[PDB]
Amino acid sequence: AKLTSAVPVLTARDVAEAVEFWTDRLGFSRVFVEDDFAGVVRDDVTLFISAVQDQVVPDNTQAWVWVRGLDELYAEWSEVVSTNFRDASGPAMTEIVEQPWGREFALRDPAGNCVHFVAE
Amino acid sequence: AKLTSAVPVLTARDVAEAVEFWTDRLGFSRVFVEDDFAGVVRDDVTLFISAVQDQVVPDNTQAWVWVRGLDELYAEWSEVVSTNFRDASGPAMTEIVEQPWGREFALRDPAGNCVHFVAEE
């Protein structure tokens, strides 16, 4: 057997809100959308979004995504999402930082998920 | 820019126990292990594992993994993982089921993460 690819599952109290953000704000498309569960895709990467009732879940939910052209992606998203990660109430993103494991930025979505985008 | 691949993050109260399960039980290899965060890999799929305080989080954490040779993978893991999914006192897996979107089994790890393995079409 061969494991070929993987799909992170983001969590949200409000899945509809999360879907609108990921598609309309960040440029993903809908794979499917239900009240309790949805999927969005951009390029080779699919993310699922699952309903929860406890905010602790999204506040502890994370995913990593590999990117060719991290600067370009940051340039796109930094226009439509706050770059004040600590102070913004809405979704926000960090700057690109050179971490020991790689160059990346983190984005916090409206549900509270923390998704890291790392240069490949 | 191009989004090329993704890495799910499983959660655990005990990251070391989670790493031991995914490697010794399920045949993933260690990528890196820290006290509060770890990475394991099999074939083209990496999973991260992150420490959390509350059991509610792993009990609500999921991931999906695409597989070529789902029956073989299931056969392998059935050698060492319970197939009584409804007993939540230990890790276990469902049978392979034909869902509307694909053929898949689900595996619940010791921490409580539910990871679905779906056959490629």
Swiss-Prot record, chain B:
One of the Pfam families matching this protein, by short name: Glyoxalase_7
GO biological process, one term: response to antibiotic
Superkingdom of the source species: Bacteria
Domain called VOC: residue spans: 2-120
Key words of the record: Antibiotic resistance
Function recorded in the entry: Binding protein with a strong affinity to the bleomycin family of antibiotics.
Subunit-level organization: Homodimer.
Stated family: Belongs to the bleomycin resistance protein family.
Protein name, as recorded: Bleomycin resistance protein
Organism of derivation: Streptoalloteichus hindustanus
